[PDB]
Structure formats: C-alpha cells, structure tokens
Amino acid sequence: MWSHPQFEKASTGREILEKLERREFTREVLKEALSINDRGFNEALFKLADEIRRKYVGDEVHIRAIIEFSNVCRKNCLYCGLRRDNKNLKRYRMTPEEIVERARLAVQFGAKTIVLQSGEDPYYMPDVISDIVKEIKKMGVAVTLSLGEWPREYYEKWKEAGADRYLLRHETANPVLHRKLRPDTSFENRLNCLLTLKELGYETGAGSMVGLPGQTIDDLVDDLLFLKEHDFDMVGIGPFIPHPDTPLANEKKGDFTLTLKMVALTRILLPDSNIPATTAMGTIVPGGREITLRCGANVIMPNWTPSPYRQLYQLYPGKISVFEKDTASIPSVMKMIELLGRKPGRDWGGRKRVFE
Ligand SMILES: C[S@@+](CC[C@H](N)C(=O)[O-])C[C@H]1O[C@@H](n2cnc3c(N)ncnc32)[C@H](O)[C@@H]1O
Ligand code: SF4
Ligand SMILES: [C-]#N
Ligand SMILES: [Cl-]
C-alpha cells in the first residue's frame, strides 16, 4: 500500500474553473466549487457568472414591484414567520381596491412587472385573484403571482385572467428534508405544481433557500441539478434566516458567501434565466443585493407593500425597514441600478432564449 496525498488547492480551483468554463457540470465539479473556501477562487467564480450574465441577459436590471397583500397562511412551514402556528403576529388582508390602486402607483413609478405574493390565504382563491389580475393587466405591465400550491384549475383560471409568470420556489430538492420542514405537503406536490405551471405556459420560477437545518453541500448540488434539469425561467435563491417565533429560531443562519456561490453557479448553469438579488440577500449583508447583482443576478424586487401592512409580512427578522416612507423602494432601486452602472429594464424583461 502507498500514500494518497491531496492536490494543491489553487490548481484544483483553476481546474474547477476550467471545467465550469467548458460547461462540464458533473456533480463532483459542482460539489468542489461549493466546497472550496478560497477568496480568490470565489472571486473568479463570481467574475465568470458576471461575464455570462453580461453576455446572455445584458445590462438591464428588471424591477419587479412586490405587493405582499395578505399574510394569512393555511400552511405551517417550520422556517416561515407566517406559519399558521405563529400566534405572535398580527394578520392582515388587503382589499382588491387597495391592491389594484397600490399596483397602479407602482406602475406610475415605473415598475414594469407587479408581483402579487401572499400566504396561502383561501379567502382570495381563485376568483378574487382573477379579478385583481385582470385589472392590473389593463395597466400595460407583466403580472407575476406567488401564491403557493393550488389546484390546476386555479392556475388555469389565473393564466386565462392574464397572469404572465408564477414564482414557486422549490425550497429544497431533498424530499426527506422538504417534508420535515413543510409538514403540510411534499416535494412531489411542489414539483407537480411547477410542472403544471410550465405546461400552462407561465414563465415559471423555482429556487431554494441556502443553509436550512439539515441541508448539506450535497443537497445544494442537488438543487443546482434540479434547476438545470427543468430550465426554469426564473430562479430565486436566498439564505435561510431563522425567525424567533418558529421551531427553527435557534438554528444557524444561512451563509452569505455560499448563497452568492449558488447564485453564481445558477447563472453559469442557466445563462439566460432571470435571477433576482433577493430581499434576504439584502437583509443578511448591507449592500447584499448590490453584491449579488455583480455575481450573476439581473432582477431586483423592491417591496411595495404599503403601511401599515408592510411590517407584518414578517417572513424572517430584518426583512422590512420602516425608516422610510412606503413609496421609497422603487426610486431607491433605480438609484442603486444607476450607481452600479446598469440600466433599468426597457420592456417587461421576460425570459428569452438566446443561449444555445
Ligand atoms: C413566504 S412565501 C409566500 C408565497 C407562497 N406562500 C410560497 O410559500 O410559495 C415566499 C418565500 O419566502 C421564503 N422564506 C420563508 N421563510 C424564510 C426564512 N425564514 N428565511 C428566508 N426565506 C424565507 C421562502 O423561500 C418562500 O418561498
Ligand atoms: S413559506 Fe409560504 S406556504 Fe409556508 S408558511 Fe410561509 S407563507 Fe405559508
Ligand atoms: C425576492 N426578491
Ligand atoms: Cl417576475
């Protein structure tokens, strides 16, 4: 028997970068990319993702204004502050008039997509959502829905009402972990919803949280390969941020650098996808969304939920700032985009197929 020494770190890093540039996306390559802890490797990975972003989605940063119109949820996800078992949260619902008029104001401030997000609140489903969608589509913008898991019939009604896109983050592709953290449902249900949304012609968004309890690097590789397999139009990635009024209050927070590497690898794997710099990335690090837009992201989603509701959509601590008026976020992100040397989107920023 003979010895078994390891290879030098920088050359292994350079070899991983060459494999990524050559698009040899094996599980071992992705695992090693996520596992290397070297600032110089990471910076090269971010620059590769940024280069691919520049070439295949260009310099426009698309603004999607989010209205979080109800924090009522019938589910009990262990990570989420809106879970039904959290009795320490005041619940709200916006009326259709409030939602439509608030969307009109975002359109006037220049948002070209309105995102309607909520807890899984049966009050609205399906007909109130359809009415709201029809009204917002008259404003000349794209509509994205992010309402959770519903019957095919509801997704079909909302497509006929004019919805363009649907964001349903897959959360974790590990089906054992998925059921432990989302005890009302399953990864199989979540995937069935995603496949139904794609079949109905929505631009379909998935994406995962990084740093969930029980999740390993191998699980993150499985997330990347799941996203690649389905060629999603949008991918939303952010760190897990523990919420004090949930069972996961004392678990580790997700790591910002690892999450950034997930964004970068997602851009490399899916060069023409729409990838936001998520709210959670700006919560965990000051300037986190700006950094993420330099590592492969090309979308930003300013929070347009009005007072007095915005502070109650408490998915995780730190999500909401109340230091400025509730109309500040769209001008703020426009200023951010300008300071980055980028441009706001000129059209609706729908996903295109330009990578072959
Ligand atoms: C709150 S839900 C609302 C829409 C719909 N109920 C759903 O679950 O798809 C939107 C996203 O918030 C994110 N989220 C929830 N709790 C979080 C936490 N503690 N840390 C980071 N993200 C969280 C999840 O990824 C979830 O997909
Ligand atoms: S993640 Fe979505 S479905 Fe789960 S508790 Fe939170 S709002 Fe409800
Ligand atoms: C979400 N941004
Ligand atoms: Cl969108």
Which tokens go with 86?
Answer: 């959290």
- Write down the CATH number for the domain with range 12-356: 3.20.20.70
Q: Under 8 Å CB-to-CB from 206, ≥6 apart: which residues?
A: 168, 169, 170, 194, 226, 227, 230, 232, 234, 235, 236
Residue among 331, 337, 342 nearest 110 (CA): 331
User: How many angstroms separate the alpha carbon of residue 66 from the centre of ligand 4?
Assistant: 9
User: Is residue 18 within a helix (H) or strand (E), and if so which, with residue range?
Assistant: helix 9-21
Pick the atom of ligand 3 nearest to 64's CA: 2
CA-closest residue to ligand 2 atom 3: 75
Experimental method: X-ray
CA separation, residue 63 to residues 162, 171, 276 (Å) = 19, 23, 9
Question: How far separated are the first and last CA of the chain, in Å rounded?
Answer: 48
CA of 272 to the centre of ligand 4 (A): 14
115 CA → ligand 4 middle, Å: 6
Contacts of 214 (CB under 8 A, 6+ apart): 177, 180, 181
Residue located nearest, by CA, to atom 2 of ligand 3: 278
Residue pair 265/227 in contact by the 8 Å Cβ criterion: no
Name residue 70's beta-bridge partners.
Answer: 93, 118
Amino acid identity, position 219:
D
| CA of 191 relative to ligand 1 center, distance in Å | 16
The span from the CA of 34 to the CA of 142, in Å, is 35
Cβ < 6 A, ligand 3 pocket: 236, 276, 278-279, 301
Residue 162, Cβ density class (10 Å: 0-12 exposed, 13-18 middle, ≥19 buried): middle
| Residue spans per domain, the chain | 12-356
SS3 assignment, position 274: strand
Is any atom of ligand 2 closer than 6 Å to the C-beta of 148?
A: yes
Q: How many C-beta atoms lie closer than 10 Å to residue 27's C-beta?
A: 12
Phi first, then psi, for residue 338 (nearest 5°) are -60, -45
How far is Cα 227 from Cα 269, in angstroms, rounded to an integer?
9
Query: How many angstroms does the Cα of residue 164 sit away from the middle of ligand 1?
Result: 21
Determine which residue's CA is closest to atom 1 belonging to ligand 3.
Answer: 278
Q: Is the distance from the beta carbon of residue 181 to the nearest atom of ligand 2 less than 6 Å?
A: no
Give the separation between CA 258 and CA 204, rounded to whole angstroms. Answer: 24
